[PDB]
Amino acid sequence: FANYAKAGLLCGNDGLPHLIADPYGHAGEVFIPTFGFLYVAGYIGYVGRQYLIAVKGEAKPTDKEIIIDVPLATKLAWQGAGWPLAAVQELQRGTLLE
Amino acid sequence: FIGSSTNLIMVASTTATLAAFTIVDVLAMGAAGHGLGVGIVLGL
Amino acid sequence: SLPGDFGFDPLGLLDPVNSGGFIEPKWLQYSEVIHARWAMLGAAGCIAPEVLGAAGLIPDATNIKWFESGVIPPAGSYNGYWADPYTIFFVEIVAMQFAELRRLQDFRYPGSMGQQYFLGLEAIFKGSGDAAYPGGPFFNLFNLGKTEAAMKELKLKEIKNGRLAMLAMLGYGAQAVMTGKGPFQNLVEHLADPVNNNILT
Amino acid sequence: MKDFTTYLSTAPVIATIWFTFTAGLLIEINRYFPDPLVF
Amino acid sequence: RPVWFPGNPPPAHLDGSLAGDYGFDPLFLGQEPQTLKWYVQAELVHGRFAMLGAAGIILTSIGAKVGLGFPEWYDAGKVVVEKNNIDFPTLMVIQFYLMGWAETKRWYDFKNPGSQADGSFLGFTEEFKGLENGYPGGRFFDPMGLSRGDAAKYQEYKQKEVKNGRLAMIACLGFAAQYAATGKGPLDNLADHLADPNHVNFATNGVSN
Amino acid sequence: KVKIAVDRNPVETSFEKWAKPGHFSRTLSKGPNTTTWIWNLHADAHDFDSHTSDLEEISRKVFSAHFGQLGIIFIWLSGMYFHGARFSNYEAWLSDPTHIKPSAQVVWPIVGQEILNGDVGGGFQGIQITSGFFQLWRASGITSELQLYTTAIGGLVMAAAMFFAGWFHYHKAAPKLEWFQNVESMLNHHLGGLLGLGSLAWAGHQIHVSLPVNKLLDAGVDPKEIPLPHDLLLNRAIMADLYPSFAKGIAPFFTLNWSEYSDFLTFKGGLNPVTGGLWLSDTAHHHVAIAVLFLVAGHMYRTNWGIGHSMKEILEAHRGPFTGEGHVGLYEILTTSWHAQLAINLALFGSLSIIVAHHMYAMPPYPYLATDYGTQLSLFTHHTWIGGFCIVGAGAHAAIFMVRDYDPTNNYNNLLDRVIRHRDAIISHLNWVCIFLGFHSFGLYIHNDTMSALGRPQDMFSDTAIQLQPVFAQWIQNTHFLAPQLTAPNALAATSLTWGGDLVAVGGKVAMMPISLGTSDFMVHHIHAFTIHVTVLILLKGVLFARSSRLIPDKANLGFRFPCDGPGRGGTCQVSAWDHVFLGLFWMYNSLSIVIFHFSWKMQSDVWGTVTASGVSHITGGNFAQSANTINGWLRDFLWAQSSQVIQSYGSALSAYGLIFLGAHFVWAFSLMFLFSGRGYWQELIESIVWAHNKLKVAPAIQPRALSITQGRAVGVAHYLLGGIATTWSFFLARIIS
């Protein structure tokens, strides 16, 4: 309770903290977290993209969806840290779309 | 122990059932007479 | 081919057609013998104090029943020992680990225990092709059964003293649970009044 | 053990060795930073 | 040749070529030859740290059991810290830097034979060579040059080193499981056992452990 | 010549096949092209008959599979003991049963879950268990946790041994077909060793450990102060003191003076008044008799000596005029088909688990069982379920035999043939009887609802207005309470208080009391009997026409598990035996659900409650007889009124039940998506989504495919059951605990 009073959330006639979702009194409620997600989700997605494409050219790709090449994935895992800088550059370059 | 109405009946029921022969027949009709006799003693 | 064969197998165990695991001719002749050899140790070992003590050679302390020695604490434990019964059981485990597993490695590989050094004894522990009957200067110092005939008969002699001593142990136990006395106190009391000191009583 | 490791790198095994990791991580962070509605 | 479990033959992947090779990998861990090249260094370092550590306790402990000055290995970290000027967090961080450096360089010799050899450092070229996975040698690691002496003389030491290594690793963990079960120093655990060995065992207090 | 036959080392033990999913079939071994592969390999994982034609390999697989199962179950049993030792209130519970709630689960302190650790007594904070272990433990004579720990470690070892056993008997020493076919020997050994020596040795535990320790506890003496159960063995002075006949030892046994053992081997019946459970003495004598019965029974069949019956002989003997050749051919079937055996065994197990529920309902065999209403409702509902499922399974496999194993040419059987030749009469008659039953059961409730709505209570089916008395049942109840006087003289009280009088109560709560039977009970039983008959209709129809019908004569070739044979013949949706099992599961759920609702309402209204000044206040005040005659009464007096405690369970220890209450509705409703739809839609949906993937170069190699029609049905029924059952589960437990 003390740590929402220090955070300074808006509490209604209910007595419960409601949230603010547009602009700057209450940025951290949604506006910051929001990026958090789009990053880590974009991270997961782009790693998964770089895996499936990296397999694609190897006779039978379907085996690598099941008996997953772990040491391939764990290298793509770290590579997928800087993904928006790659994701942008790939949209530029024009290898992003079929 | 070789005396009472418990034993008198047990020995009578065994020799009666056996009279009605290799290895397998004796242990069967012996367990018949004992399978018989026990109820007579726990009865009377 | 096995000694002690008087043809007694109601339960088709030694039948070699489609055998597996521990229902193996080679295996069971082994067990029976090692069983025999232990059983004879236990038979003579369980009674000896009760006898020799009664004989008045052994002091008042030592002259205990077999189950009062500290094997089964609730039935009685001894005191006057080099140590407690658990500091013993460890000295046992290490030894019986060595001397049972070695014996397993002759069973598993005939030649083995001959090659890999063991303080000069590796020379001794060569085996005899037959597992149960290893021999050599360690386990046959007097080179007895010098002929194939005299051996086969000694192998006859062994199994029968054994089988007897195994039943004797089945004796001393089943006897001790019902009596609550040692099978030598049971024997002398049975010499004194055969019909009063009995199962039926 | 080339074979044993391929099995450990099977889909259902990886998923589980991955989820116990990203579950712990989220239980862990909720311990030392308890009860978040901001950050 | 001699083996861990006499009679049972040793597994193929063990040649009798490596120091302390007694056909012992009952769990097929070090089968793929690279993953064993990795374990032969873990084992060496583990044993070298364990040896320094065992020598490290075995001398403090007699030093404490010879004159009432030195502290017991358990409560001898705080005694170093509190008494003397120094802090914990920084040591722990300083350590991590130096050990970090020292390791991160050994780290890139496992994957690359003669990597750090390139002089890419302080011009020190020939001192950071390969040689043999586990023995780096040169003027630093083997100053006296037993490394560059004789074929047999050095082969026998590999043997000595791994064995002492494996005994110190045991020894160390006893120190650690003996303080635990009895709450005393390893020359109080040793004095109590010499005076009355038949009674002062595990059988008393030290359970199955 | 019944003998030990084994193959040596039939299968090597390296991980070469682990690393190859779907090794077991030539089809799946090729790998996945589509995602359907993934499902198939789990679907057919245990289906050994389709893998191989060799009955040997199948036979080796099946029990090793059973050793694995038994290992798992031991590990499970190990679990409960350990927690009962480590994380429980049992010692606190072994000192004031009445005022401590049984608990053997603790939550960790994170994420608000702490609230689940409720005020359960004995100075311990936790989850109240309803498994009934605490009473088992008291019945077994367990006094301290240490004992529970030791039992736990033993179960873990046994788990290891069973796992070892299962690897062994497949990889080192796999038994030969001959072996598995020694039915007479198997039967004899299972009857005499397993059941016989099992209950004999147990009865040993009961006579040497349970009976003494129980009397001292019921006496009231502190459990810590109670002598240890081995000292009862070596000091029989304590046993002599507790029951006198021990002084004479095993002499009265051999001399046939058994009447001297009347101290601890009784026939009293009723309940122990101080504990609300059956006499342990009755139970000890029960197991003693049963052991002898089974032991002698297990010496019926011929083995390695002339003596004994042969199964085939008894079967071939038993024939008559109406049936023709009768039982002939059945032995050969039941020695070559696992499915047929599975079918038999599931029917009778299932039936057994339900009779176990009832008999445990009516005759609480454990201490302070009866008065732990949570435990009693949990156990009866549980055991009623698993029975339910097993019975449907019996039907399923019966059909599987019917399709895959039946071969008249090779293995002829006439009973079966005659059954097949008049199936139409059987199914038509079952149809009729079911419509009958449906009308004259449901119709009665609708009639009542209408009369009640139209203001005509005097015209209703009820004790007040209409009387439909259970005259037979009342007769049998009459005969049961008068039996101890006439037909069972040596028996002191009745088997159960729900027949006799003598209302026995413990700790101010009702343990048991006479159950009145009126019109409402007349109703619900006939509903049941309706539901069972419908379920039987579906499943029997399924099994009898599995092979062929008028629509699809060659159904047998198409399989046990298959969707349809197209929109032809007017449309052939759900023709397969599987689909019958499918629909059978829903009706089974229906039937079983009314039973447990019947149980819960019955118990709270007419039986359970508190005991005041020479009088009884029931939990729901005897509303049953008057309310359960209309649908509205269930809707309101049972559902609506009782759901109160679950719906406000928030903010408490019971809140998890509210969460599971909602979650189970969710999952139930979620099933309907699968049940109501078809994969045609889903596959096109998937076409569009796949487009989207391909557009961004994120298409999978394993081609995404909608579930099969069959899988859609399986997922549907599974989520339907899980949702329904879990909702009733959260309901009862929160209700009865609060």
Ligand SMILES: CC1=C[C@H](O)CC(C)(C)[C@H]1/C=C/C(C)=C/C=C/C(C)=C/C=C/C=C(C)/C=C/C=C(C)/C=C/C1=C(C)C[C@H](O)CC1(C)C
């Ligand atoms: C063969 C056959 C055939 C067909 O087919 C069928 C049938 C008939 C069934 C089968 C069977 C038979 C039989 C019965 C057998 C038996 C055996 C035995 C009993 C053994 C023992 C065996 C036994 C044994 C070894 C034993 C041993 C022992 C010992 C060492 C002892 C020790 C001791 C001593 C001294 C002292 C201390 O204080 C104590 C102790 C520690 C204790």
Ligand SMILES: CC1=C[C@H](O)CC(C)(C)[C@H]1/C=C/C(C)=C/C=C/C(C)=C/C=C/C=C(C)/C=C/C=C(C)/C=C/C1=C(C)C[C@H](O)CC1(C)C
């Ligand atoms: C190897 C070798 C080598 C080289 O070359 C040479 C040499 C050295 C000589 C050798 C050695 C040897 C040896 C060691 C031996 C041993 C033996 C024994 C001990 C036996 C026993 C043996 C033993 C035995 C039989 C035993 C038996 C017993 C019996 C019957 C018993 C009886 C009884 C009973 C039950 C009961 C009662 O109440 C009592 C009585 C009456 C008492």
Ligand SMILES: CC1=C(/C=C/C(C)=C/C=C/C(C)=C/C=C/C=C(C)/C=C/C=C(C)/C=C/C2=C(C)CCCC2(C)C)C(C)(C)CCC1
């Ligand atoms: C009647 C009859 C018959 C037969 C039948 C039979 C075949 C029967 C059988 C029966 C049997 C076959 C039985 C058995 C039984 C057994 C038992 C009853 C057991 C018991 C046990 C116990 C109680 C023990 C205990 C102990 C002691 C006391 C001490 C030490 C330890 C021991 C554990 C050993 C015939 C057909 C001929 C004819 C017609 C009629």
Ligand SMILES: CC1=C(/C=C/C(C)=C/C=C/C(C)=C\C=C\C=C(C)\C=C\C=C(C)\C=C\C2=C(C)CCCC2(C)C)C(C)(C)CCC1
């Ligand atoms: C700010 C904000 C807001 C608003 C927002 C909005 C209004 C938005 C819009 C938006 C939009 C209007 C969007 C659009 C989009 C488009 C497109 C066209 C997309 C695309 C995508 C893609 C192409 C992706 C890719 C990828 C990646 C990158 C990674 C992972 C994998 C993947 C392949 C998925 C709110 C108030 C709510 C809250 C607060 C803040």
